Amino acid sequence: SGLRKMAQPSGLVEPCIVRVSYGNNVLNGLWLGDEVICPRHVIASDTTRVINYENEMSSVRLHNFSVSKNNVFLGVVSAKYKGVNLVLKVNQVNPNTPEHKFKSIKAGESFNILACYEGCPGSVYGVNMRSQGTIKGSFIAGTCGSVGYVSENATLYFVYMHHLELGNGSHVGSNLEGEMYGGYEDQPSMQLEGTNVMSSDNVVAFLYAALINGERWFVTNTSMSLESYNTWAKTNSFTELSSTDAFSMLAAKTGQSVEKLLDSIVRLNKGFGGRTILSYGSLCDEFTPTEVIRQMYG
Amino acid sequence: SGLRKMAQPSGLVEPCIVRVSYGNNVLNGLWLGDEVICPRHVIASDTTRVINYENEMSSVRLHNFSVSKNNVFLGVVSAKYKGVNLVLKVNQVNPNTPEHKFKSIKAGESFNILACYEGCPGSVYGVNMRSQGTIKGSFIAGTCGSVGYVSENATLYFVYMHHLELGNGSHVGSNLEGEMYGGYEDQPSMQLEGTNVMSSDNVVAFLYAALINGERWFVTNTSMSLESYNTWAKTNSFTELSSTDAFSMLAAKTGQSVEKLLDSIVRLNKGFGGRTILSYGSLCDEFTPTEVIRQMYGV
Ligand SMILES: *C(=N)[C@H](C[C@@H]1CCNC1=O)NC(=O)[C@@H]1[C@@H]2[C@H](CN1C(=O)[C@@H](NS(C)(=O)=O)C(C)(C)C)C2(C)C
Ligand SMILES: *C(=N)[C@H](C[C@@H]1CCNC1=O)NC(=O)[C@@H]1[C@@H]2[C@H](CN1C(=O)[C@@H](NS(C)(=O)=O)C(C)(C)C)C2(C)C
């Protein structure tokens, strides 16, 4: 059964993806109602140098936009900035607009990515929000505007829109309100990502999933207290756990309390010694405790 | 730019999933036209012991069936075995039936699993068919009838329907014609999966994806001839490579010949030595050459 990333189904999101073109830039937009949200960098005359966005807005011609989906051409009637996103009002309303809210994702939380290639949905996969506000996915040219989403209790939330990839390979996007996650600039810059902080909540859930998979070599007879682990975590770029309550079910099923896995984290952070855990060679923090519980038990 | 096991979008498949129940057994079915296809063990009176399907079919009653989708219910007017699958005719044609075909999956090929629970699609993810006709899915209770599909050249193929989980954890399903992959029986028995043979085509593609993503510690000034690797492959449960021509473009982009990666495989098979390749601590044959080329370069 192992442990793998899953994506919630994409049915409600795909009919909202449109191809947005301006000049030499071709990417994706999110068509909801008569609005189309896209990364505002699409109207940049040159993405190899610093962009003055209000200068580009004052020189924008709505007749140069090309917003389409399949065989429907959407005429742009108004353009406005909203943060780092471009909000374009079109002459047609999306007949397949789903009931939806807008939500911001926090660090250590999982969501789904509908990877779209120049207006065409191509694939869908699950990601996780790193401490600095980035994610580790797979984006290439023409995939900006790809939408992140998550369904909670039958409520569809749009949470992410892709903008850029940093030099270290981390991927940077914004919420649908135009606020960039982690506060990164939407410029072709050399800006750095901070030091990454592993979510210890997720590493413990990852280690519980490995015990359910019959992988127990990393568990010894040594325990480590919560307080002592939290003192170790802040000097080793791990978050501190508030409590062990979230793992009550996983601990009873596997026969290992959180304190046993906390000791494993400290030992395995120095290297797996040549062995693997769920095919990984390092600690994985992309699975929340709720994810692991649902994937293993439903 | 990254490498992730991806699934194709599920929008054309979700409206075809239905809940299928009979007595105390509940699973998923595939609603196309006025036909619903499900695993036949939904009518088994006892999943605990060996099932006599001839007795179960003789004592079946159409009205004891219940197939439904979003509070709308379908009446079963006919039930028939087709291989290990039940084919039920219902009194309503699926208005969202997509243009589709049926197809079998070969070893080493990738397809998409739409995991479902009691007729409600829950998650979608990509899998790769292992050499013995199994997949390392994540099916748990109530996921029987979950549908595998693949989109090729704008043609939708239904390729998989979930049945059981072997004692070793591997997952066995059938195609949509009732033929179980790998020849396993739909019986609660201790069937043993054969020896897994790693797809060398997929491992090479995985290592090419690593080079594209900046991983290169596993390549040295060494390179292994194709025949020399194939002789090693038949000894260490790896597929033999007919040629290197499927990697012509990947070899040009990364400047690394297949032969250089062939020696990497032989060395890496003995362990990574504490190093990683795109988070992996072991070789992974879950990505085809076509998967990698498309994910890295768009195409
Ligand atoms: C959207 N269409 C792309 C997605 C990129 C392409 C490679 N991987 C991705 O995630 N975004 C951009 O093209 C984005 C646009 C221009 C430059 N840019 C980048 O992502 C660059 N990275 S960076 C932070 O060094 O500028 C690069 C080098 C193209 C990956 C702007 C930031 C406006
Ligand atoms: C469908 N609802 C299940 C899917 C299973 C549940 C656990 N993981 C899965 O993939 N199918 C069955 O329950 C299936 C039914 C009965 C026995 N069976 C199994 O998968 C069993 N495995 S085995 C090969 O030992 O019989 C088991 C013990 C439930 C996992 C039959 C084959 C009819």
Side-chain angles (χ1 to χ4, degrees), chain A residues 1 4 6-7 9-11 14 122-124 126 136 138-139 165 171 279 281 286, chain B residues 1 4 6-7 9-11 14 122-126 136-138 279 281 295-296:
Chain A
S1 211
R4 63 155 67 243
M6 290 158 202
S10 39
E14 307 165 36
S123 56
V124 59
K136 277 306 217 256
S138 153
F139 299 83
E165 181 183 311
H171 294 112
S279 75
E286 289 190 69
Chain B
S1 275
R4 307 281 278 197
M6 275 169 190
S10 65
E14 299 164 47
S123 44
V124 66
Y125 57 93
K136 290 303 203 188
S138 323
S279 298
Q295 197 175 135
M296 306 294 103

PDB file of all heavy atoms in Angstrom, chain A residues 1 4 6-7 9-11 14 122-124 126 136 138-139 165 171 279 281 286, chain B residues 1 4 6-7 9-11 14 122-126 136-138 279 281 295-296:
ATOM      1  N   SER A   1       0.832  -1.198   0.000  1.00  0.00           N
ATOM      2  CA  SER A   1       0.000   0.000   0.000  1.00  0.00           C
ATOM      3  C   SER A   1       0.870   1.253   0.000  1.00  0.00           C
ATOM      4  O   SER A   1       0.532   2.255  -0.632  1.00  0.00           O
ATOM      5  CB  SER A   1      -0.941   0.001   1.208  1.00  0.00           C
ATOM      6  OG  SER A   1      -2.156   0.669   0.912  1.00  0.00           O
ATOM      7  N   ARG A   4       1.825   7.448  -0.830  1.00  0.00           N
ATOM      8  CA  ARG A   4       2.002   8.218  -2.050  1.00  0.00           C
ATOM      9  C   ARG A   4       1.108   9.447  -2.013  1.00  0.00           C
ATOM     10  O   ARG A   4       0.066   9.459  -1.351  1.00  0.00           O
ATOM     11  CB  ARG A   4       1.677   7.379  -3.290  1.00  0.00           C
ATOM     12  CG  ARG A   4       0.231   6.924  -3.349  1.00  0.00           C
ATOM     13  CD  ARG A   4      -0.206   6.667  -4.773  1.00  0.00           C
ATOM     14  NE  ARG A   4       0.495   5.528  -5.358  1.00  0.00           N
ATOM     15  CZ  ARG A   4       1.307   5.610  -6.407  1.00  0.00           C
ATOM     16  NH1 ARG A   4       1.521   6.782  -6.990  1.00  0.00           N
ATOM     17  NH2 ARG A   4       1.903   4.521  -6.872  1.00  0.00           N
ATOM     18  N   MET A   6      -1.647  11.831  -3.339  1.00  0.00           N
ATOM     19  CA  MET A   6      -2.849  11.768  -4.150  1.00  0.00           C
ATOM     20  C   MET A   6      -3.398  13.170  -4.354  1.00  0.00           C
ATOM     21  O   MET A   6      -3.176  14.068  -3.538  1.00  0.00           O
ATOM     22  CB  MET A   6      -3.927  10.896  -3.506  1.00  0.00           C
ATOM     23  CG  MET A   6      -3.614   9.420  -3.508  1.00  0.00           C
ATOM     24  SD  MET A   6      -4.537   8.570  -2.222  1.00  0.00           S
ATOM     25  CE  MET A   6      -3.534   7.114  -2.034  1.00  0.00           C
ATOM     26  N   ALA A   7      -4.118  13.347  -5.453  1.00  0.00           N
ATOM     27  CA  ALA A   7      -4.795  14.596  -5.753  1.00  0.00           C
ATOM     28  C   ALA A   7      -6.298  14.371  -5.728  1.00  0.00           C
ATOM     29  O   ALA A   7      -6.794  13.374  -6.262  1.00  0.00           O
ATOM     30  CB  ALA A   7      -4.366  15.141  -7.118  1.00  0.00           C
ATOM     31  N   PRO A   9      -9.975  14.919  -7.099  1.00  0.00           N
ATOM     32  CA  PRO A   9     -10.299  14.940  -8.532  1.00  0.00           C
ATOM     33  C   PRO A   9     -10.476  16.350  -9.074  1.00  0.00           C
ATOM     34  O   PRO A   9     -10.795  17.291  -8.348  1.00  0.00           O
ATOM     35  CB  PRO A   9     -11.603  14.138  -8.609  1.00  0.00           C
ATOM     36  CG  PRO A   9     -11.515  13.215  -7.451  1.00  0.00           C
ATOM     37  CD  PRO A   9     -10.858  14.005  -6.356  1.00  0.00           C
ATOM     38  N   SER A  10     -10.258  16.483 -10.376  1.00  0.00           N
ATOM     39  CA  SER A  10     -10.094  17.782 -11.006  1.00  0.00           C
ATOM     40  C   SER A  10     -11.339  18.245 -11.750  1.00  0.00           C
ATOM     41  O   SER A  10     -11.297  19.285 -12.415  1.00  0.00           O
ATOM     42  CB  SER A  10      -8.897  17.744 -11.946  1.00  0.00           C
ATOM     43  OG  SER A  10      -8.816  16.507 -12.634  1.00  0.00           O
ATOM     44  N   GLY A  11     -12.448  17.511 -11.629  1.00  0.00           N
ATOM     45  CA  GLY A  11     -13.594  17.747 -12.495  1.00  0.00           C
ATOM     46  C   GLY A  11     -14.140  19.161 -12.431  1.00  0.00           C
ATOM     47  O   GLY A  11     -14.513  19.730 -13.458  1.00  0.00           O
ATOM     48  N   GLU A  14     -11.170  21.909 -14.141  1.00  0.00           N
ATOM     49  CA  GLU A  14     -10.741  21.920 -15.541  1.00  0.00           C
ATOM     50  C   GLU A  14     -11.548  22.862 -16.428  1.00  0.00           C
ATOM     51  O   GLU A  14     -10.936  23.576 -17.241  1.00  0.00           O
ATOM     52  CB  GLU A  14     -10.771  20.498 -16.115  1.00  0.00           C
ATOM     53  CG  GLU A  14     -10.017  19.460 -15.314  1.00  0.00           C
ATOM     54  CD  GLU A  14     -10.397  18.050 -15.719  1.00  0.00           C
ATOM     55  OE1 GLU A  14     -10.640  17.825 -16.923  1.00  0.00           O
ATOM     56  OE2 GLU A  14     -10.460  17.171 -14.835  1.00  0.00           O
ATOM     57  N   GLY A 122      -3.218  19.472 -18.157  1.00  0.00           N
ATOM     58  CA  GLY A 122      -2.412  18.336 -18.562  1.00  0.00           C
ATOM     59  C   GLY A 122      -2.264  17.262 -17.505  1.00  0.00           C
ATOM     60  O   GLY A 122      -2.229  16.071 -17.827  1.00  0.00           O
ATOM     61  N   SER A 123      -2.176  17.663 -16.240  1.00  0.00           N
ATOM     62  CA  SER A 123      -1.970  16.709 -15.159  1.00  0.00           C
ATOM     63  C   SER A 123      -2.423  17.339 -13.850  1.00  0.00           C
ATOM     64  O   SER A 123      -2.700  18.538 -13.776  1.00  0.00           O
ATOM     65  CB  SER A 123      -0.504  16.264 -15.079  1.00  0.00           C
ATOM     66  OG  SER A 123       0.359  17.375 -14.928  1.00  0.00           O
ATOM     67  N   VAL A 124      -2.501  16.507 -12.816  1.00  0.00           N
ATOM     68  CA  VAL A 124      -2.904  16.951 -11.486  1.00  0.00           C
ATOM     69  C   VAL A 124      -2.168  16.106 -10.455  1.00  0.00           C
ATOM     70  O   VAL A 124      -2.006  14.893 -10.625  1.00  0.00           O
ATOM     71  CB  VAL A 124      -4.439  16.882 -11.307  1.00  0.00           C
ATOM     72  CG1 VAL A 124      -4.948  15.466 -11.504  1.00  0.00           C
ATOM     73  CG2 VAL A 124      -4.849  17.425  -9.948  1.00  0.00           C
ATOM     74  N   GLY A 126      -0.602  16.265  -5.988  1.00  0.00           N
ATOM     75  CA  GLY A 126      -0.635  16.907  -4.686  1.00  0.00           C
ATOM     76  C   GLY A 126       0.714  17.507  -4.319  1.00  0.00           C
ATOM     77  O   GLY A 126       1.763  16.963  -4.655  1.00  0.00           O
ATOM     78  N   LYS A 136       7.219  22.377  -3.801  1.00  0.00           N
ATOM     79  CA  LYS A 136       8.080  21.591  -4.680  1.00  0.00           C
ATOM     80  C   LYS A 136       7.178  20.793  -5.615  1.00  0.00           C
ATOM     81  O   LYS A 136       6.679  19.725  -5.251  1.00  0.00           O
ATOM     82  CB  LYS A 136       9.006  20.683  -3.875  1.00  0.00           C
ATOM     83  CG  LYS A 136      10.263  21.375  -3.360  1.00  0.00           C
ATOM     84  CD  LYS A 136      11.029  22.044  -4.495  1.00  0.00           C
ATOM     85  CE  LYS A 136      12.532  21.927  -4.299  1.00  0.00           C
ATOM     86  NZ  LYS A 136      13.144  23.201  -3.827  1.00  0.00           N
ATOM     87  N   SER A 138       6.309  20.493 -10.232  1.00  0.00           N
ATOM     88  CA  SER A 138       6.986  20.310 -11.515  1.00  0.00           C
ATOM     89  C   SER A 138       6.336  21.267 -12.511  1.00  0.00           C
ATOM     90  O   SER A 138       5.305  20.942 -13.107  1.00  0.00           O
ATOM     91  CB  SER A 138       6.905  18.862 -11.986  1.00  0.00           C
ATOM     92  OG  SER A 138       6.969  18.775 -13.398  1.00  0.00           O
ATOM     93  N   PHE A 139       6.941  22.439 -12.677  1.00  0.00           N
ATOM     94  CA  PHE A 139       6.446  23.466 -13.580  1.00  0.00           C
ATOM     95  C   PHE A 139       7.484  23.747 -14.655  1.00  0.00           C
ATOM     96  O   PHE A 139       8.686  23.793 -14.376  1.00  0.00           O
ATOM     97  CB  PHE A 139       6.121  24.763 -12.828  1.00  0.00           C
ATOM     98  CG  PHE A 139       5.053  24.616 -11.781  1.00  0.00           C
ATOM     99  CD1 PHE A 139       5.366  24.155 -10.514  1.00  0.00           C
ATOM    100  CD2 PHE A 139       3.739  24.956 -12.058  1.00  0.00           C
ATOM    101  CE1 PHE A 139       4.390  24.022  -9.546  1.00  0.00           C
ATOM    102  CE2 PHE A 139       2.755  24.831 -11.090  1.00  0.00           C
ATOM    103  CZ  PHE A 139       3.084  24.363  -9.833  1.00  0.00           C
ATOM    104  N   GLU A 165       9.624  30.184 -10.704  1.00  0.00           N
ATOM    105  CA  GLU A 165      10.492  29.207 -10.060  1.00  0.00           C
ATOM    106  C   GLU A 165      11.769  29.903  -9.614  1.00  0.00           C
ATOM    107  O   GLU A 165      12.406  30.603 -10.406  1.00  0.00           O
ATOM    108  CB  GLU A 165      10.825  28.053 -11.006  1.00  0.00           C
ATOM    109  CG  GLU A 165      11.716  26.987 -10.399  1.00  0.00           C
ATOM    110  CD  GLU A 165      12.083  25.906 -11.396  1.00  0.00           C
ATOM    111  OE1 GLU A 165      11.170  25.381 -12.065  1.00  0.00           O
ATOM    112  OE2 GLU A 165      13.286  25.585 -11.514  1.00  0.00           O
ATOM    113  N   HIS A 171       9.125  26.510  -6.179  1.00  0.00           N
ATOM    114  CA  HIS A 171       8.098  27.123  -7.002  1.00  0.00           C
ATOM    115  C   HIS A 171       7.296  28.110  -6.169  1.00  0.00           C
ATOM    116  O   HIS A 171       6.958  27.837  -5.013  1.00  0.00           O
ATOM    117  CB  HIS A 171       7.200  26.053  -7.617  1.00  0.00           C
ATOM    118  CG  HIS A 171       7.919  25.177  -8.595  1.00  0.00           C
ATOM    119  ND1 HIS A 171       8.180  23.845  -8.353  1.00  0.00           N
ATOM    120  CD2 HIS A 171       8.460  25.453  -9.804  1.00  0.00           C
ATOM    121  CE1 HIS A 171       8.835  23.334  -9.380  1.00  0.00           C
ATOM    122  NE2 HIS A 171       9.018  24.289 -10.274  1.00  0.00           N
ATOM    123  N   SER A 279      10.819   4.112   0.270  1.00  0.00           N
ATOM    124  CA  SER A 279      11.603   4.387  -0.932  1.00  0.00           C
ATOM    125  C   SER A 279      12.336   5.721  -0.841  1.00  0.00           C
ATOM    126  O   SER A 279      13.152   6.036  -1.711  1.00  0.00           O
ATOM    127  CB  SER A 279      10.736   4.349  -2.197  1.00  0.00           C
ATOM    128  OG  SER A 279       9.929   5.510  -2.304  1.00  0.00           O
ATOM    129  N   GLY A 281      15.104   8.386   0.664  1.00  0.00           N
ATOM    130  CA  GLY A 281      16.412   8.406   1.276  1.00  0.00           C
ATOM    131  C   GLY A 281      16.601   9.504   2.297  1.00  0.00           C
ATOM    132  O   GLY A 281      17.681   9.611   2.883  1.00  0.00           O
ATOM    133  N   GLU A 286       5.872  16.078   3.472  1.00  0.00           N
ATOM    134  CA  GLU A 286       4.806  16.529   2.588  1.00  0.00           C
ATOM    135  C   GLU A 286       3.458  15.887   2.891  1.00  0.00           C
ATOM    136  O   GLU A 286       2.492  16.145   2.166  1.00  0.00           O
ATOM    137  CB  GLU A 286       5.188  16.263   1.128  1.00  0.00           C
ATOM    138  CG  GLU A 286       6.299  17.167   0.616  1.00  0.00           C
ATOM    139  CD  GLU A 286       6.505  17.051  -0.880  1.00  0.00           C
ATOM    140  OE1 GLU A 286       5.617  17.495  -1.639  1.00  0.00           O
ATOM    141  OE2 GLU A 286       7.553  16.515  -1.297  1.00  0.00           O
TER     142      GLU A 286
ATOM    143  N   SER B   1      13.375  22.053 -12.360  1.00  0.00           N
ATOM    144  CA  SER B   1      11.954  22.348 -12.530  1.00  0.00           C
ATOM    145  C   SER B   1      11.062  21.298 -11.882  1.00  0.00           C
ATOM    146  O   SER B   1       9.879  21.550 -11.665  1.00  0.00           O
ATOM    147  CB  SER B   1      11.600  22.484 -14.008  1.00  0.00           C
ATOM    148  OG  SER B   1      11.851  23.799 -14.470  1.00  0.00           O
ATOM    149  N   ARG B   4       7.524  14.824 -10.678  1.00  0.00           N
ATOM    150  CA  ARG B   4       6.481  14.298  -9.810  1.00  0.00           C
ATOM    151  C   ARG B   4       5.668  13.262 -10.571  1.00  0.00           C
ATOM    152  O   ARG B   4       5.411  13.419 -11.766  1.00  0.00           O
ATOM    153  CB  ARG B   4       5.555  15.411  -9.293  1.00  0.00           C
ATOM    154  CG  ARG B   4       6.273  16.581  -8.631  1.00  0.00           C
ATOM    155  CD  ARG B   4       6.691  16.243  -7.207  1.00  0.00           C
ATOM    156  NE  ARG B   4       5.590  16.409  -6.264  1.00  0.00           N
ATOM    157  CZ  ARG B   4       5.738  16.501  -4.946  1.00  0.00           C
ATOM    158  NH1 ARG B   4       6.948  16.444  -4.406  1.00  0.00           N
ATOM    159  NH2 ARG B   4       4.674  16.650  -4.167  1.00  0.00           N
ATOM    160  N   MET B   6       2.611  12.068 -11.869  1.00  0.00           N
ATOM    161  CA  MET B   6       1.428  12.847 -12.191  1.00  0.00           C
ATOM    162  C   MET B   6       0.302  11.952 -12.689  1.00  0.00           C
ATOM    163  O   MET B   6       0.534  10.857 -13.210  1.00  0.00           O
ATOM    164  CB  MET B   6       1.745  13.908 -13.245  1.00  0.00           C
ATOM    165  CG  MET B   6       2.314  15.193 -12.676  1.00  0.00           C
ATOM    166  SD  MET B   6       2.939  16.256 -13.984  1.00  0.00           S
ATOM    167  CE  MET B   6       3.789  17.502 -13.022  1.00  0.00           C
ATOM    168  N   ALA B   7      -0.923  12.440 -12.517  1.00  0.00           N
ATOM    169  CA  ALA B   7      -2.121  11.805 -13.041  1.00  0.00           C
ATOM    170  C   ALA B   7      -2.766  12.723 -14.068  1.00  0.00           C
ATOM    171  O   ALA B   7      -2.753  13.947 -13.913  1.00  0.00           O
ATOM    172  CB  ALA B   7      -3.121  11.493 -11.924  1.00  0.00           C
ATOM    173  N   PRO B   9      -5.956  14.482 -15.948  1.00  0.00           N
ATOM    174  CA  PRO B   9      -7.198  14.999 -15.356  1.00  0.00           C
ATOM    175  C   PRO B   9      -8.329  13.980 -15.403  1.00  0.00           C
ATOM    176  O   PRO B   9      -8.404  13.134 -16.296  1.00  0.00           O
ATOM    177  CB  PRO B   9      -7.513  16.226 -16.217  1.00  0.00           C
ATOM    178  CG  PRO B   9      -6.179  16.672 -16.714  1.00  0.00           C
ATOM    179  CD  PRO B   9      -5.393  15.412 -16.942  1.00  0.00           C
ATOM    180  N   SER B  10      -9.220  14.079 -14.419  1.00  0.00           N
ATOM    181  CA  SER B  10     -10.233  13.064 -14.162  1.00  0.00           C
ATOM    182  C   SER B  10     -11.644  13.515 -14.519  1.00  0.00           C
ATOM    183  O   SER B  10     -12.603  12.796 -14.220  1.00  0.00           O
ATOM    184  CB  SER B  10     -10.173  12.647 -12.692  1.00  0.00           C
ATOM    185  OG  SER B  10     -10.531  13.733 -11.853  1.00  0.00           O
ATOM    186  N   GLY B  11     -11.794  14.675 -15.168  1.00  0.00           N
ATOM    187  CA  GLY B  11     -13.119  15.244 -15.366  1.00  0.00           C
ATOM    188  C   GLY B  11     -14.047  14.387 -16.206  1.00  0.00           C
ATOM    189  O   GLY B  11     -15.259  14.369 -15.971  1.00  0.00           O
ATOM    190  N   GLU B  14     -15.125  11.026 -13.705  1.00  0.00           N
ATOM    191  CA  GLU B  14     -15.913  11.196 -12.484  1.00  0.00           C
ATOM    192  C   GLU B  14     -17.413  10.992 -12.678  1.00  0.00           C
ATOM    193  O   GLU B  14     -18.021  10.286 -11.857  1.00  0.00           O
ATOM    194  CB  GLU B  14     -15.627  12.580 -11.883  1.00  0.00           C
ATOM    195  CG  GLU B  14     -14.174  12.806 -11.492  1.00  0.00           C
ATOM    196  CD  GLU B  14     -13.855  14.271 -11.270  1.00  0.00           C
ATOM    197  OE1 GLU B  14     -14.636  14.955 -10.576  1.00  0.00           O
ATOM    198  OE2 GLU B  14     -12.826  14.742 -11.798  1.00  0.00           O
ATOM    199  N   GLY B 122     -12.722   9.898  -4.894  1.00  0.00           N
ATOM    200  CA  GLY B 122     -12.013  10.513  -3.791  1.00  0.00           C
ATOM    201  C   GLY B 122     -10.672  11.110  -4.160  1.00  0.00           C
ATOM    202  O   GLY B 122     -10.347  12.225  -3.737  1.00  0.00           O
ATOM    203  N   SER B 123      -9.874  10.383  -4.938  1.00  0.00           N
ATOM    204  CA  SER B 123      -8.558  10.876  -5.314  1.00  0.00           C
ATOM    205  C   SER B 123      -8.147  10.271  -6.647  1.00  0.00           C
ATOM    206  O   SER B 123      -8.681   9.249  -7.083  1.00  0.00           O
ATOM    207  CB  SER B 123      -7.510  10.564  -4.239  1.00  0.00           C
ATOM    208  OG  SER B 123      -7.646   9.241  -3.755  1.00  0.00           O
ATOM    209  N   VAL B 124      -7.184  10.926  -7.289  1.00  0.00           N
ATOM    210  CA  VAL B 124      -6.636  10.483  -8.562  1.00  0.00           C
ATOM    211  C   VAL B 124      -5.116  10.512  -8.465  1.00  0.00           C
ATOM    212  O   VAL B 124      -4.537  11.438  -7.882  1.00  0.00           O
ATOM    213  CB  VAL B 124      -7.152  11.353  -9.734  1.00  0.00           C
ATOM    214  CG1 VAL B 124      -6.642  12.782  -9.633  1.00  0.00           C
ATOM    215  CG2 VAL B 124      -6.775  10.735 -11.070  1.00  0.00           C
ATOM    216  N   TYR B 125      -4.472   9.481  -9.008  1.00  0.00           N
ATOM    217  CA  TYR B 125      -3.019   9.386  -8.949  1.00  0.00           C
ATOM    218  C   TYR B 125      -2.533   8.445 -10.040  1.00  0.00           C
ATOM    219  O   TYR B 125      -3.298   7.644 -10.585  1.00  0.00           O
ATOM    220  CB  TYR B 125      -2.536   8.914  -7.572  1.00  0.00           C
ATOM    221  CG  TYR B 125      -3.112   7.589  -7.121  1.00  0.00           C
ATOM    222  CD1 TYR B 125      -2.441   6.400  -7.368  1.00  0.00           C
ATOM    223  CD2 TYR B 125      -4.322   7.529  -6.442  1.00  0.00           C
ATOM    224  CE1 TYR B 125      -2.958   5.189  -6.954  1.00  0.00           C
ATOM    225  CE2 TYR B 125      -4.848   6.321  -6.025  1.00  0.00           C
ATOM    226  CZ  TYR B 125      -4.161   5.153  -6.285  1.00  0.00           C
ATOM    227  OH  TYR B 125      -4.676   3.945  -5.874  1.00  0.00           O
ATOM    228  N   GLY B 126      -1.243   8.555 -10.346  1.00  0.00           N
ATOM    229  CA  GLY B 126      -0.640   7.740 -11.379  1.00  0.00           C
ATOM    230  C   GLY B 126       0.014   6.489 -10.820  1.00  0.00           C
ATOM    231  O   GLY B 126       0.531   6.478  -9.707  1.00  0.00           O
ATOM    232  N   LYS B 136       1.347  -1.107  -7.444  1.00  0.00           N
ATOM    233  CA  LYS B 136       1.497  -0.707  -6.046  1.00  0.00           C
ATOM    234  C   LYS B 136       0.614   0.512  -5.783  1.00  0.00           C
ATOM    235  O   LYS B 136       1.075   1.644  -5.618  1.00  0.00           O
ATOM    236  CB  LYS B 136       2.959  -0.431  -5.717  1.00  0.00           C
ATOM    237  CG  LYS B 136       3.834  -1.676  -5.687  1.00  0.00           C
ATOM    238  CD  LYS B 136       3.302  -2.707  -4.698  1.00  0.00           C
ATOM    239  CE  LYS B 136       4.402  -3.655  -4.240  1.00  0.00           C
ATOM    240  NZ  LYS B 136       3.870  -4.786  -3.426  1.00  0.00           N
ATOM    241  N   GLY B 137      -0.688   0.256  -5.762  1.00  0.00           N
ATOM    242  CA  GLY B 137      -1.663   1.281  -5.464  1.00  0.00           C
ATOM    243  C   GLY B 137      -1.766   1.526  -3.973  1.00  0.00           C
ATOM    244  O   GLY B 137      -0.870   1.196  -3.193  1.00  0.00           O
ATOM    245  N   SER B 138      -2.885   2.118  -3.575  1.00  0.00           N
ATOM    246  CA  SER B 138      -3.171   2.367  -2.168  1.00  0.00           C
ATOM    247  C   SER B 138      -4.642   2.081  -1.899  1.00  0.00           C
ATOM    248  O   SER B 138      -5.346   2.843  -1.235  1.00  0.00           O
ATOM    249  CB  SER B 138      -2.792   3.791  -1.774  1.00  0.00           C
ATOM    250  OG  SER B 138      -1.611   4.211  -2.438  1.00  0.00           O
ATOM    251  N   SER B 279      15.006  12.708  -4.099  1.00  0.00           N
ATOM    252  CA  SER B 279      14.394  12.210  -2.866  1.00  0.00           C
ATOM    253  C   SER B 279      14.420  10.686  -2.771  1.00  0.00           C
ATOM    254  O   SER B 279      14.299  10.131  -1.674  1.00  0.00           O
ATOM    255  CB  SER B 279      12.956  12.720  -2.717  1.00  0.00           C
ATOM    256  OG  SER B 279      12.917  14.134  -2.630  1.00  0.00           O
ATOM    257  N   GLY B 281      15.812   7.027  -2.431  1.00  0.00           N
ATOM    258  CA  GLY B 281      16.953   6.292  -1.937  1.00  0.00           C
ATOM    259  C   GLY B 281      17.213   4.998  -2.669  1.00  0.00           C
ATOM    260  O   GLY B 281      18.172   4.294  -2.344  1.00  0.00           O
ATOM    261  N   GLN B 295       6.937  15.601 -19.282  1.00  0.00           N
ATOM    262  CA  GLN B 295       6.958  16.405 -18.065  1.00  0.00           C
ATOM    263  C   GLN B 295       8.111  17.402 -18.064  1.00  0.00           C
ATOM    264  O   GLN B 295       7.973  18.503 -17.519  1.00  0.00           O
ATOM    265  CB  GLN B 295       7.036  15.501 -16.832  1.00  0.00           C
ATOM    266  CG  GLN B 295       6.644  16.196 -15.533  1.00  0.00           C
ATOM    267  CD  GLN B 295       6.612  15.256 -14.341  1.00  0.00           C
ATOM    268  OE1 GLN B 295       7.108  15.586 -13.265  1.00  0.00           O
ATOM    269  NE2 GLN B 295       6.018  14.081 -14.523  1.00  0.00           N
ATOM    270  N   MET B 296       9.245  17.045 -18.675  1.00  0.00           N
ATOM    271  CA  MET B 296      10.410  17.925 -18.651  1.00  0.00           C
ATOM    272  C   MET B 296      10.345  18.990 -19.740  1.00  0.00           C
ATOM    273  O   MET B 296      10.784  20.125 -19.525  1.00  0.00           O
ATOM    274  CB  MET B 296      11.698  17.110 -18.802  1.00  0.00           C
ATOM    275  CG  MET B 296      11.875  15.980 -17.800  1.00  0.00           C
ATOM    276  SD  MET B 296      12.073  16.524 -16.096  1.00  0.00           S
ATOM    277  CE  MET B 296      10.439  16.186 -15.446  1.00  0.00           C
TER     278      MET B 296
END
